[PDB]
C-alpha cells in the first residue's frame, strides 16, 4: 500500500515560481531502490515526464526543461518537492507524482501514481470578451442552410453565456465549449444553422453576457455581401 498525494496552489501568476509537493506514504524515500518522478499533462494533451529523484540524492530532468526545474526530497516529511520557475499560461497542466521502478532487476516505469493536481497559470485580471460576427454566405448548399455565429474572444474567467435574439431563437443553436488559449484567456463560438432563404430578411443578434466582468454585448450578424 504505497500511496502518493500531490499538493500545491491551484493558481499561479505568470513569472511566479510554482512549488508542488508529493507526500509518499507506506514507503520510505531513504530505502534503496525507491525513486519518485513528476509528470505533467497539459489540458487535453499527452503525458510528459519532467523529473526524477532517487534514494541517493540523484536528480534527473527533462532535457527540454532542465533549467526551469528543481527536484528535491524532504526526508523528515517523506515528501518530494518540484519547483518550476517562470510560470507561463502555456504551462497550465495537471501534475502527477509517481513512484518509479528504478533498478535493473525491476525495470524503469511508473508503478504507482498520485491522483494529480491542476495548476492554472493566469493573471489576477477579469477581462470581458470582444465579440465579432461570423457572417454567413448566401451561397447554395445541398441542405438549403447556412451557418452564422458570434466569436467570443479573449475573456477570463469562465463562464460566459450566449443567446440569440434575446432568447427567441433556440432552434439550430450550438454554443461550443470554450478553449483555454496560450494567453491564459478563453474563447468560444456560438453558431446557428439557419435557412439560406432567410439571410436577406431575418435579423440575427447574438447576446453575450460575461457575468464575471459584467460585460454584455449585442452583435448583429449580417450576411456576407460583395
Amino acid at each position: 500500500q504505497v500511496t502518493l498525494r500531490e499538493s500545491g496552489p491551484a493558481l499561479v501568476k505568470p513569472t511566479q515560481t510554482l512549488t508542488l509537493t508529493c507526500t509518499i506514504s507506506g514507503l520510505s524515500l531513504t530505502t534503496s531502490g525507491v525513486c519518485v518522478s513528476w509528470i505533467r499533462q497539459p489540458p487535453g494533451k499527452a503525458l510528459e515526464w519532467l523529473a526524477l529523484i532517487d534514494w541517493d540524492d540523484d536528480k534527473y530532468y527533462s532535457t527540454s526543461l532542465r533549467t526551469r526545474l528543481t527536484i528535491s526530497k524532504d526526508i523528515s516529511k517523506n515528501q518530494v518537492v518540484l519547483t518550476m520557475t517562470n510560470m507561463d499560461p502555456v504551462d497550465t497542466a495537471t501534475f502527477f507524482c509517481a513512484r518509479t521502478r528504478c533498478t535493473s532487476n525491476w525495470g524503469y516505469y511508473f508503478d504507482s501514481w498520485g491522483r494529480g493536481t491542476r495548476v492554472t497559470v493566469s493573471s489576477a485580471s477579469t477581462k470581458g470578451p470582444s465579440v465579432f460576427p461570423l457572417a454567413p454566405s448566401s451561397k447554395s448548399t445541398s441542405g438549403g442552410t447556412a451557418a452564422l455565429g458570434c466569436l467570443v474572444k479573449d475573456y477570463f474567467p469562465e463562464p460566459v453565456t450566449v443567446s440569440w435574439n434575446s432568447g427567441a431563437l433556440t432552434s439550430g443553436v450550438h454554443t461550443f465549449p470554450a478553449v483555454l488559449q496560450s494567453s491564459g484567456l478563453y474563447s468560444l463560438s456560438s453558431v446557428v444553422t439557419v435557412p439560406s432563404s432567410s439571410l436577406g430578411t431575418q435579423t440575427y443578434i447574438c447576446n453575450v453576457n460575461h457575468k464575471p466582468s459584467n460585460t454584455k454585448v449585442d452583435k448583429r450578424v449580417e450576411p456576407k455581401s460583395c
Binding site: S37, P43, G44, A46, L47, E48, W49, L52, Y60, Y61, S62, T63, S64, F96, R101, G107, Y108, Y109, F110, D111, S112, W113, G114, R115, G116, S130, F132, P133, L134, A135, A147, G149, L151, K153, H174, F176, P177, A178, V179, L180, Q181, S182, S187, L188, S189, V191, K224, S225, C226
Partner: protein
C-alpha cells in the same frame, strides 16, 4: 512525440483492436523497455503493461503487449465498456536522455453509429480586422468516435504557431464537438491566397478553405 500512436482506435463490444507505438533507434530499437498506461478521462493514468508484456494485478489477459523492431503494440481482445479510455506507450530515449511517452490513443468502445464531422470554417470578420486582429474559426461537430486531430495550412504550408484547439466534448445527442482557432496578423490574412483547417477523424482528413477575396 518521439513515440507515435494513432489518435483513435475503436471497436464494438467483443471485437479486438490493436494500438501501435512506433519509435526509433534511439528508444524502442535501442532495447529500452516499453510500457503502457491506461487513463480514463477524469482520472490519473494507471500502469497497464510493464516491460513489454507483463500485466499488473487486475489487468486481464485479453490485454496483451508485444514488441518488434522499432515498434511496440497493445492488443485488446474482447472489448468491454470499461476499456474506453486513453492509452499511452512509454519508453526511454537516449538521444533526448529522458523518459518519453507516445501522443496517446483514445480507444472508443462503440455504442452508437460512427459519424463523420461537420466542419465549418469562418474567416476573420471585417470588425476584427478593424481592431488590427484576425482569427480563423474552425468548428467541428456531430462526430463519433470523439477523437479528432486538427492542423492548419497557409496556402499549402503547415502552420503550427497561433493554433488553439479544444478537446472533444460530448453534445446533447451524445455525438462530439470541438473547435480550433488560428490567430494571425491582418497582414498575413490578406497576404496569402488562402488558409485551411484540416480535420482528421479516424484516418479521414477533410479540409475546409477560406480566402480573403471570398465575398
Amino acid at each position: 512525440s518521439v513515440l507515435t500512436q494513432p489518435p483513435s482506435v475503436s471497436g464494438a463490444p467483443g471485437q479486438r483492436v490493436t494500438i501501435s507505438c512506433t519509435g526509433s533507434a534511439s528508444n524502442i530499437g535501442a532495447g529500452y523497455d516499453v510500457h503502457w498506461y491506461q487513463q480514463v478521462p477524469g482520472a490519473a493514468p494507471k500502469l497497464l503493461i510493464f516491460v513489454y508484456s507483463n500485466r499488473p494485478s487486475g489487468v486481464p489477459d485479453r490485454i496483451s503487449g508485444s514488441k518488434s523492431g522499432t515498434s511496440a503494440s497493445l492488443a485488446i481482445s474482447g472489448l468491454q465498456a470499461e476499456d474506453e479510455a486513453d492509452y499511452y506507450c512509454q519508453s526511454y530515449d537516449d538521444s533526448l536522455r529522458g523518459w518519453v511517452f507516445g501522443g496517446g490513443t483514445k480507444l472508443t468502445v462503440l455504442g452508437q453509429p460512427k459519424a463523420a464531422p461537420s466542419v465549418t470554417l469562418f474567416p476573420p470578420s471585417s470588425e476584427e480586422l478593424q481592431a488590427n486582429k484576425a482569427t480563423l474559426v474552425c468548428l467541428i461537430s456531430d462526430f463519433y468516435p470523439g477523437a479528432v486531430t486538427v492542423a492548419w495550412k497557409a496556402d499549402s504550408s503547415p502552420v503550427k504557431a497561433g493554433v488553439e484547439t479544444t478537446t472533444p466534448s460530448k453534445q446533447s445527442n451524445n455525438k462530439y464537438a470541438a473547435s480550433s482557432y488560428l490567430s494571425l496578423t491582418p497582414e498575413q490574412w490578406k497576404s496569402h491566397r488562402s488558409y485551411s483547417c484540416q480535420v482528421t477523424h479516424e484516418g479521414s482528413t477533410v479540409e475546409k478553405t477560406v480566402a480573403p477575396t471570398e465575398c
